[PDB]
Design an enzyme around this catalytic site. Sequence first.
Site: not given
Ligand SMILES: [Mg+2]
Lengths: 434, 432, 432, 434
Positions: B42, B155, B164, B205, B242, B289, B316, B341, B369, B392
């Site tokens: 947003s 994360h 990731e 995920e 990633d 990534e 990305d 994406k 995703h 992915k």
């Molecule tokens: Mg990424």
Amino acid sequence: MPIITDVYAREVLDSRGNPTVEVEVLTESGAFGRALVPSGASTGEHEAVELRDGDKSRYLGKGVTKAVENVNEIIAPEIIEGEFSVLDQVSIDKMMIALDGTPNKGKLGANAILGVSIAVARAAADLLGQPLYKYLGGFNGKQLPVPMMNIVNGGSHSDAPIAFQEFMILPVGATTFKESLRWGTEIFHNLKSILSKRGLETAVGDEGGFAPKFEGTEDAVETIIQAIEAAGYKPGEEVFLGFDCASSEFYENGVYDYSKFEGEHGAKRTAAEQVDYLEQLVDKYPIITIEDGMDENDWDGWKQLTERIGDRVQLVGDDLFVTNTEILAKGIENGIGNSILIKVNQIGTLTETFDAIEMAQKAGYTAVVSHRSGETEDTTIADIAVATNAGQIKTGSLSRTDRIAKYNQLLRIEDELFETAKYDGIKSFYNLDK
Amino acid sequence: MPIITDVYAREVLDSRGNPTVEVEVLTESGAFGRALVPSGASEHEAVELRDGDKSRYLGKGVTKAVENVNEIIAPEIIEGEFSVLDQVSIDKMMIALDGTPNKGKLGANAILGVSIAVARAAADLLGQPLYKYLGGFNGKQLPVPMMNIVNGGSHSDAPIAFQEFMILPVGATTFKESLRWGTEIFHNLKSILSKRGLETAVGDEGGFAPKFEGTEDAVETIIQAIEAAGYKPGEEVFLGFDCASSEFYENGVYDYSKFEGEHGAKRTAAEQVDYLEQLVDKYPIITIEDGMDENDWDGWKQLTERIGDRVQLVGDDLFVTNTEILAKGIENGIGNSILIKVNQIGTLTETFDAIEMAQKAGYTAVVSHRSGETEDTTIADIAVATNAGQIKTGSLSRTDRIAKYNQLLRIEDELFETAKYDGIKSFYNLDK
Amino acid sequence: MPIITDVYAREVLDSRGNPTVEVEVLTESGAFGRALVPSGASEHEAVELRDGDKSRYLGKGVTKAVENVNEIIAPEIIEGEFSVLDQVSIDKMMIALDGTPNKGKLGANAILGVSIAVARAAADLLGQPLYKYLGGFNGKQLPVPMMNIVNGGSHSDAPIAFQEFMILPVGATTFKESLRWGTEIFHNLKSILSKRGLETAVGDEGGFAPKFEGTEDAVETIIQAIEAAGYKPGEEVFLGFDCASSEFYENGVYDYSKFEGEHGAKRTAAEQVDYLEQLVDKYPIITIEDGMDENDWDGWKQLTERIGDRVQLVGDDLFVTNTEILAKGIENGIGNSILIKVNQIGTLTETFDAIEMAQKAGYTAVVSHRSGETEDTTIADIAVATNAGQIKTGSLSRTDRIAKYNQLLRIEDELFETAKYDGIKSFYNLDK
Amino acid sequence: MPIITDVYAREVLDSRGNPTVEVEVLTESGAFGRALVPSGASTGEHEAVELRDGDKSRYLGKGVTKAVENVNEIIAPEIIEGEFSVLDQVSIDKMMIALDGTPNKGKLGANAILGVSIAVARAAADLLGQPLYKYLGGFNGKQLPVPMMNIVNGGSHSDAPIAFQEFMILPVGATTFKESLRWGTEIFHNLKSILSKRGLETAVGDEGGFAPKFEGTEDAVETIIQAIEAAGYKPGEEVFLGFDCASSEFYENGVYDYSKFEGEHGAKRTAAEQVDYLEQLVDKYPIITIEDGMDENDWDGWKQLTERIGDRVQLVGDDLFVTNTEILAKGIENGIGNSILIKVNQIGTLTETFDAIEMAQKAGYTAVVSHRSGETEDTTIADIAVATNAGQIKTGSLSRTDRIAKYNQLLRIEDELFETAKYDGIKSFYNLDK
Ligand SMILES: [Mg+2]
Ligand SMILES: [Mg+2]
């Protein structure tokens, strides 16, 4: 148009990463239904058993190629050569029960049979141009369920000193299912912050709820309450709480042994003390529902518990009834419980499922249709709750699409029902005097 | 018959429990399409429209987006008598109707909902699988999946910088087999973690965020799970990162101290490249990534010159599914792969243009995703429609992820003997 | 295609030779439904509309009701473009169109005609048997029939207070067999009556009103007819009453002297219960309808406490197919069964709500005929749609009754091996 | 579209509680017809006989499983394998007559054959989108019958001292069938009050009329008249009376013995005295029709009666003709009677039925289609009366749906005919000079 021309099964995956059965049905005119079966039990005392391969070198023995074969090589040819119409749900279900020929469904697999059973019903709904709930329940299927929303886990699903396996919120005071779902998520997300500020685990389990390291049961309950209030809702009125004690997990020799999960000093309670304890909890906290408060074999305890809080609290047999109508009937005849958890794959056909719901309903019990730990993108249980005007559902927390997809389907059902839609709130608990 | 007679939007929930858009399209003859929009954002990105009403869904409602579909976009389609098969004119018309490059007046989420639902309805009308309607008769190549397994950075509470860690079952014969391996490795890892007393609950995920001691602990433990399942880390199953290096990059420096403790190296552009090359030399890593910051174009150049011949380097944050920026990457020889994406660009038409641009430059296009997913499986079909060779779409847990995997299983099953799984040959971008 | 294109009403005759309403519904695609409305009532009850024109049908014409359908209800449906499948919105709309709780402006008979004809047309469109359209795929349970055989009270010149005496062939294996028994018992009774010089002509419900000496004579003679046909009164065939005690209840007393001579007992609430218990103990009686006055709630409580565990106690006048009053009965533990008269509530939707309420309280819902019937057989399908387990649709004489029985035969035949007849297990309301 | 693909029979019940045959016919395109056969006679001299099982331990020997079997196992396979179109009524009817091979229809059963015959015709009407009456009688089927409405019974259907079996009202003076029906009910209901005020029986018999304990024939007649007048109608003009004497029931050895039913002092009349008596009654009361005024074998008497009142009174053979065209023909050639009661199941096919009506009509006789004592929800006889512009029907009193359903069907026929509908009133009696 309606004659079944193809029945096809394949191996796919459930929400836990384990194989399960998917079945597709086609009629001569091209009506189509697809069913994905949730995880089950391959051994049990009184339930339909699913068939696993046991090949330790594929999917760690959890593959379902045998069940898939049975669909493609045994069930489908009986259906195709029999020329069954897609509309004859009961004859097809009866034929499959007899073709397996065991009370277990363990020859063909409950997973094989159910996949077919649901695929057929969905194809029939597609053929008629009917929403599934109305095909299954007739023209008056219109009541949206109050959802039991998993929020916090314990017992064997947690490291925290808590014996009860799951804690739930119930947004009974909302006026639409849509609103009730909103409240759920707001409360869920508020709880996440609170936990994060406390430095507790925020990752989710199978049902998409939390298993944080609370100090104990009261810590857990009161923290849920706090999240309800912080989101702007009232605990006594708008949102209620529920348990799945799964008390069988910590019962042995007439002792409810809380030390199996609550550490050295956990109470070792007798049946009479378990009831007192649950009554205390219910008088203290706004708890409207308790699942498996007593052991799956402690019928005297269940009796005592039903006599004591059953007029004002919902008491749900899950392990007690195991979605088995011979057991439900004995429970009804002995005044034990006032609600039954309906797990579709624990019984194995849609027909038998509707018979269990009807039996439950006609005894003044509530029939709460339920997810499994391993779920799929299938949303059939949402349609079953509305089809039967069940009034309640139990389909998980407010994260993970294996759970949310059911909530979404309920939103679509409510939307489509428009001004005919009904959400009874507290009056959904017709099984309760007070 | 193919003329669109109804376009209808609705507020539903995503896999994180936040509102998203669902759109349904009907034609005169009863053909039907449903799309759900994944979670978005947003700059240089298509933006989703959020309500901002603090009293509803904590400000994340999408009633205005839903309303833009039903009160603005739908009547244009309906009054225009667009055929459901005119995907490109419909998308084009929506871009013009919004008028801003952002898609910010109607919302990327309003627009994309319509765009996808229109395509699905076209596929339904024609009796075609969606991958074949989107890609033509030759869409037949199943992707090697990038399977998230461990999370770090923001994360995780663990001292790891990269966001990731992934496994890639490139050595499998079929997609079906490769998915099996993914699950077996994942379940082996799970029990190794619980035997070490580490956390087993999953994130967005569907992967793990265990409190490892460091980046080498995480990787080495992933490798052990691969071997405990009976697969060879060098040939059958490779690893991937990633890094999301934009997250720990401040003032010209890659500051691992952001996530990796108090003595995490502060690193220059040249020292990042060195470290990444070190990891690649010390472990079977086939893809990175965002190994460099979204604005460190010099660093990206350096990294691509260094390992680009033998390691996939995916933009990305670098490209943000924006073809202007992609073009510049290609022109300057940076990266060799782009994460696509769909909701970040906002139409199917622009998504396919973006993929086509990538492929024509010798880049791979990895359909992706988002953290907030849905029961929607379109990205599976996009992957196959474009013979992308890669996808992915998450770990081996949560139906938000598994539904996509399941759809790839149906696609492969349907394709039967025409189905292709290239394995390591999917990396046509790699000179090695 | 399912949109309703014509709704048409017409004045016809009922089984008593008085006017009633017939309604016909058509859809765009030619699907068709016809309903006829049974005789009703011109408080707390949906009321039927009668003309009051002394020069036509003795004031019982229904031209205004017919006109309300054709000039008011039909255009609302037609202009509204309602689908024939939207049963609940159509019924709801009619309730709102009438505006009074009575249904007294348009007439319960105008409304119900439309309601039933719409459902029948939906069933026709879908190619479904009506019981399956109404009840879903699992409507398969055939009812035990409550077969009227002897009449008393105000339906007889004989000194008997109770209005109806019934047989119930619970012990049969199938509905087909149970219907056979009904007829054999009935014909045996007929010849026993003519051998005693008693009257053999039938009343409204196709049963007998013979000049018996008293209530014990009637019952004992029914039992003898059961035994003369070779069936066992205790197990295969039970008895039932409709006392209609509201009829002989004045000033706090059950005055049997109203019908039972000059020395018929005047009885208190407690003495009624005693008498009913006496009868139940002295005869194989499984059901009593309106054993206490419609307003004697204390007495109903008493009677239910006394014999409710082992005898079905049906509210007819007590509940008047009104869910407000039913709810109160349930809340106060009075009765264990409700007589559902579809035209007394006025829509199919409210009928199903009323049945559903009953069933969810552990009550049985006994779908019922009225004194003035028609060739319409919908109540048979309702019984099966709801797996009610019971029906009360008359004696074994007159097509107004037999047509319903015949429709149950077709339903059972059609259901084939899926058909269920529970026998005594139909009484799930009974603790014994 | 029109080829017959299924013919199915089952056991159901008639209005007296006795088994009868129901048959359903389906064509390949899905056109459907259902027929229910009324009660018949299983023995007789000159009529088609229905087949009963004779199993004393089911339905007291009145079951029709054999007839049902014959449909399902003999007639249906001939029809299906023959590939008859549903439109070839006459060939199918001729095929069934020959397949039974007896003049009786007693091998297969008149009930079996008729059920098929009517089911086919109804299916054909459904296939074409035609109202049945127009399919059966062509485009000009438009005349509604004056109804003979049973009101009072006697003879063997009563305990009262009355020899005549039935008394009827005929609303010939109405201008529509709709109005004529209204009058019927008003008169019926008024009669009920009058009887009730007299303290007489009000319960009804098989035809839905009354069998009260009147003092005798004049008491009965005059009380009917009284009911006509009390309802506001005129006996000489708007409403007329009729009899079924069923004189065979009390005739033996050339004597019409009224004492079989009217007690010790009942007149024992010769043939010439029977005629005088009926002439007297007709000169006294507004009687327009008499059924079986003389015995089924007293042809000389019938002749005498026809010569004497036949110019101004309708004389109907029921037992005389037995819906048999060889007997009707002899009657026509001898100038006996001027009307015939057509009982469809007494002849056994629709084809033969239409041949009897045509034969009757072409001799200047009236053909009055008739119910049986055991009736069903079938309304076919209403369509047959209009199809043939018969002008009269006899389908019972004004209670019981077994009777009223026919009247209702006539209301629907008149409604649907709209401005083309025709109700001839007194001119329906084209068989009468005065
Ligand atoms: Mg990424
Ligand atoms: Mg009653």
